Amino acid sequence: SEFMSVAVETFGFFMSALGLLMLGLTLSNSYWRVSTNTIFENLWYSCATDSLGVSNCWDFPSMLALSGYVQGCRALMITAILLGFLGLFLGMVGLRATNVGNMDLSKKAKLLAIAGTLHILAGACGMVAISWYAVNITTDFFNPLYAGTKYELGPALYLGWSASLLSILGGICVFSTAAAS
Ligand SMILES: CCCCCCCC/C=C\CCCCCCCC(=O)OC[C@H](O)CO
Numbered sequence: 276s277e278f279m280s281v282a283v284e285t286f287g288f289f290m291s292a293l294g295l296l297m298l299g300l301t302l303s304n305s306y307w308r309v310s311t312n313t314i315f316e317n318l319w320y321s322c323a324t325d326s327l328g329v330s331n332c333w334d335f336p337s338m339l340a341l342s343g344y345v346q347g348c349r350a351l352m353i354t355a356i357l358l359g360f361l362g363l364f365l366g367m368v369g370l371r372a373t374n375v376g377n378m379d380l381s382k383k384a385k386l387l388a389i390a391g392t393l394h395i396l397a398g399a400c401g402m403v404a405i406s407w408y409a410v411n412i413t414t415d416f417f418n419p420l421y422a423g424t425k426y427e428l429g430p431a432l433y434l435g436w437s438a439s440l441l442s443i444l445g446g447i448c449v450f451s452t453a454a455a456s
Pocket of ligand 1: 302303319320
């Protein structure tokens, strides 16, 4: 019975770590959306590939981010990564075999529950940011009246959606094992 708890604990911990790492990869990924020249943007840069092949990038203007949804998506992604770091750290200390200080199993269980919640919240923040970003792009693309540039969903959004799910599912596992102590 103890093996099963440890296995799920270990599994959930590595899932959370994987989700956090991918969240960081998502935030720094160049392809949040691509013009259906060729324009591709993330939360930080707006770029353009001119004929033929040459690509240039400019910083995503802060007023544009503020007047839109980008600055909000920035805040949710940054929060998610910070929460995931706090969760990874506390989760690492909360593992059964871990000897950082000299805490009993009960104190470890409390830490795992906190770490578990942090990963769930991190996945939630990432989930909202990706979805918020995605809906804005999708609404414009399928709008006949929309005169502006139309974008496709970028690969990073599928990476972020996966990352968030991994964080949530991982956090659930860690939290479940914590409740059993
Ligand atoms: C174990 C966990 C490991 C993974 C966790 C990694 C956390 C950091 C990764 C990405 C954050 C940075 C994303 C890219 C930041 C770009 C900053 C930039 O150059 O911005 C230019 C300008 O300010 C824009 O307007």
